[PDB]
Amino acid sequence: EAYWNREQEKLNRQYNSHLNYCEPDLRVTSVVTGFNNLPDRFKDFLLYLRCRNYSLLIDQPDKCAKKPFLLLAIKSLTPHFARRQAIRESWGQESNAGNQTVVRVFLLGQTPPEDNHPDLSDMLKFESEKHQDILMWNYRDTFFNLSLKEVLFLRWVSTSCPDTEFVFKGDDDVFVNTHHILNYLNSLSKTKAKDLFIGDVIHNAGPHRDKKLKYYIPEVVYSGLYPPYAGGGGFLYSGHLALRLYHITDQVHLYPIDDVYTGMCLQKLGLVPEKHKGFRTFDIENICSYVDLMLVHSRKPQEMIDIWSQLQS
Amino acid sequence: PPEAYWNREQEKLNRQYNSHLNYCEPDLRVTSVVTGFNNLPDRFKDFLLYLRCRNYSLLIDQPDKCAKKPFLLLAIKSLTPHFARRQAIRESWGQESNAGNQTVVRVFLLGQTPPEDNHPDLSDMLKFESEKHQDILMWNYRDTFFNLSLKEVLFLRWVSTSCPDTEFVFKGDDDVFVNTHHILNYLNSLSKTKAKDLFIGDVIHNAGPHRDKKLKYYIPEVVYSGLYPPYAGGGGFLYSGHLALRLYHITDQVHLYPIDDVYTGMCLQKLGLVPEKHKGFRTFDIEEKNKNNICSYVDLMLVHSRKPQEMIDIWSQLQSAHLKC
Ligand SMILES: *[C@@H]1O[C@H](CO)[C@@H](O[C@@H]2O[C@H](CO)[C@@H](O[C@@H]3O[C@H](CO)[C@@H](O)[C@H](O[C@H]4O[C@H](CO)[C@@H](O)[C@H](O)[C@@H]4O)[C@@H]3O)[C@H](O)[C@H]2NC(C)=O)[C@H](O)[C@H]1NC(C)=O
Ligand SMILES: *[C@@H]1O[C@H](CO)[C@@H](O[C@@H]2O[C@H](CO)[C@@H](O[C@@H]3O[C@H](CO)[C@@H](O)[C@H](O[C@H]4O[C@H](CO)[C@@H](O)[C@H](O)[C@@H]4O)[C@@H]3O)[C@H](O)[C@H]2NC(C)=O)[C@H](O)[C@H]1NC(C)=O
Ligand SMILES: CC(=O)N[C@H]1[C@H](O[C@@H]2[C@@H](O)[C@H](O)O[C@H](CO)[C@@H]2O)O[C@H](CO)[C@@H](O[C@@H]2O[C@H](CO)[C@H](O)[C@H](O)[C@H]2O)[C@@H]1O
Ligand SMILES: CC(=O)N[C@H]1[C@H](O[C@@H]2[C@@H](O)[C@H](O)O[C@H](CO)[C@@H]2O)O[C@H](CO)[C@@H](O[C@@H]2O[C@H](CO)[C@H](O)[C@H](O)[C@H]2O)[C@@H]1O
Ligand SMILES: O=c1ccn([C@@H]2O[C@H](COP(=O)(O)OP(=O)(O)O)[C@@H](O)[C@H]2O)c(=O)[nH]1
Ligand SMILES: O=c1ccn([C@@H]2O[C@H](COP(=O)(O)OP(=O)(O)O)[C@@H](O)[C@H]2O)c(=O)[nH]1
Numbered sequence: 354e355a356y357w358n359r360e361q362e363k364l365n366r367q368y369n370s371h372l373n374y375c376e377p378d379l380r381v382t383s384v385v386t387g388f389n390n391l392p393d394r395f396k397d398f399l400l401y402l403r404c405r406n407y408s409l410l411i412d413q414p415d416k417c418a419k420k421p422f423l424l425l426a427i428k429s430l431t432p433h434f435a436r437r438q439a440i441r442e443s444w445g446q447e448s449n450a451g452n453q454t455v456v457r458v459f460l461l462g463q464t465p466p467e468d469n470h471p472d473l474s475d476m477l478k479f480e481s482e483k484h485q486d487i488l489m490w491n492y493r494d495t496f497f498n499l500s501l502k503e504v505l506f507l508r509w510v511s512t513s514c515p516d517t518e519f520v521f522k523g524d525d526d527v528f529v530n531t532h533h534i535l536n537y538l539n540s541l542s543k544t545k546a547k548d549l550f551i552g553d554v555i556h557n558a559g560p561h562r563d564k565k566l567k568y569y570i571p572e573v574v575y576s577g578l579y580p581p582y583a584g585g586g587g588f589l590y591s592g593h594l595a596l597r598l599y600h601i602t603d604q605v606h607l608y609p610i611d612d613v614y615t616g617m618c619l620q621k622l623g624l625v626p627e628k629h630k631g632f633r634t635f636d637i638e639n640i641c642s643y644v645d646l647m648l649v650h651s652r653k654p655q656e657m658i659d660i661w662s663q664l665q666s
Numbered sequence: 667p668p669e670a671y672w673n674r675e676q677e678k679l680n681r682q683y684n685s686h687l688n689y690c691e692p693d694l695r696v697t698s699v700v701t702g703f704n705n706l707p708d709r710f711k712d713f714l715l716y717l718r719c720r721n722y723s724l725l726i727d728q729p730d731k732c733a734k735k736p737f738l739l740l741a742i743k744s745l746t747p748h749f750a751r752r753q754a755i756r757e758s759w760g761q762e763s764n765a766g767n768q769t770v771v772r773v774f775l776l777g778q779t780p781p782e783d784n785h786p787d788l789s790d791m792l793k794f795e796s797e798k799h800q801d802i803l804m805w806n807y808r809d810t811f812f813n814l815s816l817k818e819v820l821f822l823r824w825v826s827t828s829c830p831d832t833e834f835v836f837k838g839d840d841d842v843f844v845n846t847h848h849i850l851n852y853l854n855s856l857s858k859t860k861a862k863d864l865f866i867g868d869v870i871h872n873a874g875p876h877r878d879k880k881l882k883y884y885i886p887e888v889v890y891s892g893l894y895p896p897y898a899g900g901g902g903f904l905y906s907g908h909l910a911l912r913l914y915h916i917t918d919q920v921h922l923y924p925i926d927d928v929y930t931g932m933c934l935q936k937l938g939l940v941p942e943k944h945k946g947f948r949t950f951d952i953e954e955k956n957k958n959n960i961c962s963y964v965d966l967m968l969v970h971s972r973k974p975q976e977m978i979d980i981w982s983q984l985q986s987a988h989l990k991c
């Protein structure tokens with residue numbers, strides 16, 4: 354009865370246009386109960402659900418010219434200049450130690466004037482030319498379009514970085530202990546590494562029905578429970594799985610919560626992401642508190658540099 | 667009954683006028699004369715050790731900013747990383763203009779954000795921004811909360827040196843919405859007498875220092891004793907350029923204070939003046955229920971606090987607000 358569930362079931366029957374239909378899908382105004390009274394973000398989500406063929410405005414095509422051991426992929430918005438630079442100087446440094454290459458990309462969409470964003474296009478061009486780590490696509494960068502940010506990033510992995518051994522995807526305000534991540538990745542068996550997917554995995558979750566939370570999903574949009582999913586603050590997976598995940602995205606309708614969407618894709622593949630206790634996407638309760646952690650949400654740019662500096666000793 | 671350290675040093679200054687300005691070595695005396703110095707937070711140690719130093723130089727100047735005599739100079743406190751805040755101001759209420767040959771010009775007021783304070787290095791982008799927009803003033807001191815009174819004194823020096831003929835000054839924060847049209851209408855309503863010593867804002871009377879160690883405005887009893895003079899909250903206040911010159915001259919006679927808007931109130935009190943409350947300055951915001959009605963902003967001078975998109979949104983709706991409301 355909920356809209357997403359019914360359309361997804363239609364998709365299941367077709368695989369057992371929803372991909373490049375980019376006119377407004379006016380059907381939703383008649384088939385979604387109370388559509389006129391939905392918040393604008395749901396109107397936009399429903400009207401443009403069947404469009405995901407957006408193009409790269411800023412690419413870094415040689416980012417993976419040397420096959421990486423680890424790709425860091427960080428969700429960011431144009432105005433977050435200090436967040437990105439703190440990451441570059443702390444846990445997101447690119448490196449080649451042990452010939453285990455780490456490369457870094459930030460994942461951006463457009464911040465257009467119609468959404469009341471200041472025009473930062475000249476600063477973003479300066480930054481992209483200076484640091485060569487900005488990927489930017491021509492879609493409206495919004496909270497409910499983070500699942501678009503996920504799908505287009507996975508597409509970019511498939512086209513431009515398909516041979517990375519591992520992928521870390523996360524937020525631009527989480528602290529990551531990249532040394533611990535690399536140590537963990539190097540201790541993996543070959544079998545465990547082929548389909549690795551770990552994070553702060555949430556089981557038996559359901560959609561928030563509370564209208565004051567940013568995660569609110571109306572009953573007319575989605576019914577039932579969520580699959581197991583790793584919290585989007587940051588998760589870690591094999592590049593092999595990144596390609597299998599990209600292939601399966603066509604068979605899963607976009608969903609307004611992006612980390613739930615990745616969990617939906619894993620489930621369709623027959624996989625279950627595994628919890629690693631070092632991923633603290635809901636923060637901690639002292640620099641020694643951070644020694645054994647993989648990730649902590651959330652930290653400001655100065656805090657990111659401070660923690661990283663103290664951890665090096 | 668010995669006063670607190672700031673009061674005692676201010677008493678010494680008062681008697682000297684009825685070095686504290688370019689002594690930039692650490693004043694190790696404070697470790698002996700400030701009660702409990704060793705147990706103070708680092709920000710108080712730094713403030714006390716370097717209290718007598720304020721001859722910092724401009725690294726980035728805009729020397730022709732006031733080549734055309736302004737009617738109103740907008741001076742906005744900002745920090746290096748705040749690119750989106752500054753651009754939103756440029757496009758909304760901080761636009762430069764010449765309507766009615768009443769020139770409005772804009773500067774942002776910055777210090778350094780050094781790597782030793784764990785700041786990411788954004789210096790090349792700031793230099794690019796300055797080259798593009800020609801509205802960055804930057805001095806070579808450590809930009810911190812407790813150095814904002816330094817930001818105030820160095821800005822007033824720049825007005826005396828480089829913009830002394832501006833008719834009015836608005837000084838405010840980079841996270842406030844300002845109804846600049848209402849400000850200009852108000853300034854054009856003033857008698858010549860009221861305008862000569864104009865100083866208005868969200869004026870707080872009978873305030874004292876916060877003694878709760880958990881608040882960012884905390885001030886220890888060993889640092890400052892007694893009450894605060896009347897003062898306009900720093901989110902933004904409005905005053906004459908004539909008074910800006912009088913305020914600059916008097917800064918030499920008032921020791922820096924960790925809270926910048928209290929410092930400005932101290933300087934006004936030394937001038938024999940009392941800032942006046944204007945109800946349109948909402949430095950503690952407006953009612954939660956009226957935040958999404960643009961008519962709520964028509965009669966306001968200033969609202970704290972708003973994000974870059976919110977400032978642009980409010981400004982855009984305000985340009986057609988005369989059609990409703
Ligand atoms: C995720 O990103 C996608 C891609 O950027 C984004 O899709 C875009 O949404 C906007 C609406 O938010 C669409 O813009 C509309 O296009 C139609 C074309 O006919 C216009 O008629 C619409 O007019 C509206 O706005 C007018 C004023 O400008 C009003 O007068 C009028 O009444 C309408 O309200 C409107 O401009 C745009 O076409 C798509 N672009 C695509 C599909 O490529 C989507 O919104 C984002 N999703 C979320 C959840 O944020
Ligand atoms: C307001 O701005 C002023 C001007 O920027 C700023 O003054 C500066 O303060 C810093 C301290 O925070 C001073 O730097 C110190 O200088 C002394 C020598 O005079 C050094 O011994 C200090 O070394 C420290 O760090 C070393 C390495 O970690 C340690 O080994 C050592 O023990 C110290 O911890 C440090 O370099 C600087 O000299 C002044 N500059 C000037 C021009 O006065 C002031 O701090 C700001 N005030 C506030 C309240 O923020
Ligand atoms: C089972 C679970 O953990 N579900 C969500 C969790 O609900 C909490 C309840 O289990 C608990 O009893 O009460 C608290 C109230 O204090 C919570 O309601 O809440 C978290 C935080 O919202 C959810 O994780 C988040 O889910 C959203 C999507 O709704 C999104 O995926 C986000 O990234 C993730 O952090 C749990 O799913
Ligand atoms: C007289 C006054 O307003 N004093 C400060 C005010 O104190 C409030 C108390 O009067 C009341 O009993 O409790 C409330 C808390 O619910 C307040 O504590 O608090 C405001 C907010 O801090 C102060 O304004 C701020 O002062 C700091 C310096 O201390 C700084 O100048 C800042 O710009 C300003 O907004 C009142 O001074
Ligand atoms: O339109 C958006 C909104 C958010 N983000 C990024 O998504 C991540 C999560 O945002 P937020 O902190 O608001 O979400 P929460 O952690 O509260 O779920 C952050 O890295 C944001 O920079 C984004 O890229 N585009
Ligand atoms: O080290 C600093 C800290 C703050 N600010 C500016 O001072 C103003 C007030 O900052 P904040 O909002 O944190 O203070 P609050 O309103 O909470 O008293 C804003 O314009 C900041 O950009 C600054 O210039 N340097």
Ligand SMILES: *[C@@H]1O[C@H](CO)[C@@H](O)[C@H](O)[C@H]1NC(C)=O
Pocket residue numbers: 373374375404406407408
């Ligand atoms: C997606 O593809 C269709 C044609 O197949 C095209 O009309 C549409 O403009 C494309 N969408 C975008 C955003 O380019």
Ligand SMILES: *[C@@H]1O[C@H](CO)[C@@H](O)[C@H](O)[C@H]1NC(C)=O
Pocket residue numbers: 688689690719721722723
């Ligand atoms: C201020 O002046 C004194 C000498 O006049 C000098 O030693 C000191 O370094 C100056 N301070 C700064 C920050 O230039």
Ligand SMILES: *[C@@H]1O[C@H](CO)[C@@H](O)[C@H](O)[C@H]1NC(C)=O
Pocket residue numbers: 734735736767769
């Ligand atoms: C316009 O303003 C300037 C000061 O900014 C003044 O010198 C000039 O005389 C004015 N011109 C007119 C037309 O009054």
Ligand SMILES: [Mg+2]
Pocket residue numbers: 524526650651
């Ligand atoms: Mg977050």
Ligand SMILES: [Mg+2]
Pocket residue numbers: 839841970971
């Ligand atoms: Mg503020």
